[PDB]
Design a protein around this ligand. Structure first.
Ligand code: CA
Length: 352
């Protein structure tokens, strides 16, 4: 079906007439997508000729392990990534169990794209937009059951001292409806934007059942629009979590926060603070902060923290259908449903 448990409604390339192809390498993925633009007469078709389901069986563990050992040598290398540009027939890139990639997936001006069961880590090119997953001007995209990692560390002498490694999942432009679910993101400094600038506001994005561990900031850095974050497990957040900016609205429900600094804020602009609706999280009142090691800090410019742990605005009726489990169930069970090799398993109340 087209249900993603979020704003994105897609089946990807898992539709009628889909052509199934197996990619053994990054280059195969590129050659496969390219060939999919040609019709029966060998002539290009705008948006692609047919739907695709690409099963990636490649393994680049040697690159990953080599990079994991020399963290500071990555930012200056050439970035590596597969570009899914202007492909709208529907496409699904799914990793075979045991596969891995030291390259990213950059989606641009496309639609109905599903990325599943991919293990991407320690990407090169942090100083040259070496994102793991980029969703740009692309509606109906589903980023599900992936493991995205690097090192939550900033080396010295990197451009802007913020380029050791780029982001895990950056969303920007007219990527109007996106669902980011069941991903295991760890060891990442900049998790992901939701608007590339003050002017790039909007979109409806859902983050659910994601497991974040040892991440510094941007969970996401929201620029306007709506963000619905439910059933996520946030732990070891070393900087800030959800940063709601430019009057964006967020519904933060049934998540589990632990060992986090500034879990819900609106900072760095000094104005146009966003709002949030808090409900059913493990934290219910300020008393719980001490219980789960939640600390807050101030900013040099005007900011708004959720230290009173109260709702500061409203949120529209959540269009889609979804069944959130309790905050405890997430904390207990989520680590077994998030990531690669979980056969795309989902967490339900019955499993609680
Ligand atoms: Ca980026």
């Amino acid at each position: 079906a087209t249900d993603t448990g979020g704003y994105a409604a897609t089946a990807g390339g898992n539709v009628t007439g889909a052509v199934s192809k197996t990619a053994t390498s990054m280059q195969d993925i590129v050659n496969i997508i390219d060939a999919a633009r040609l019709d029966a007469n060998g002539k290009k078709v705008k948006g692609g000729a047919y739907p695709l389901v690409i099963t990636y069986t490649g393994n680049e563990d040697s690159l990953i392990n080599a990079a994991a050992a020399n963290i500071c040598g990555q930012w200056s290398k050439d970035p590596r990534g597969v570009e899914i540009k202007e492909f709208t027939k529907g496409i699904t890139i799914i990793g075979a169990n045991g596969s891995s990639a030291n390259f990213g997936i950059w989606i641009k001006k496309s639609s109905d794209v599903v990325v599943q069961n991919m293990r991407i880590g320690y990407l090169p090119g942090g100083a040259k937009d070496g994102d793991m997953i980029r969703v740009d001007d692309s509606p109906n995209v589903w980023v599900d059951h992936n493991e995205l990692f690097a090192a939550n560390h900033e080396c010295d002498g990197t451009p802007d001292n913020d380029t050791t490694f780029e982001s895990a999942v950056d969303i920007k432009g007219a990527s109007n409806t996106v669902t980011v679910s069941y991903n295991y993101i760890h060891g990442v400094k900049k998790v992901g934007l939701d608007g590339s600038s003050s002017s790039d506001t909007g979109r409806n994005i859902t983050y659910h059942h994601n497991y974040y561990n040892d991440v510094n900031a941007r969970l996401p850095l929201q620029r306007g629009g709506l963000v619905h974050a439910y059933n996520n497990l946030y732990t070891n957040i070393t900087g800030s979590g959800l940063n709601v900016r430019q009057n964006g609205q967020a519904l933060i429900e049934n998540n589990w926060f632990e060992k986090a600094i500034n879990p819900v804020t609106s900072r760095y602009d000094g104005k146009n603070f966003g709002t949030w609706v808090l409900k059913g999280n493990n934290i219910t009142k300020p008393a719980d902060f001490s219980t789960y090691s939640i600390t807050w800090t101030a900013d040099t410019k005007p900011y708004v923290n959720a230290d009173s742990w109260t709702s500061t605005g409203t949120f529209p009726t959540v269009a889609y259908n979804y069944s959130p489990v309790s905050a405890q169930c997430v904390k207990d069970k989520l680590p077994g449903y998030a990531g690669v090799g979980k056969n795309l398993a989902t967490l339900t109340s019955t499993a609680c």
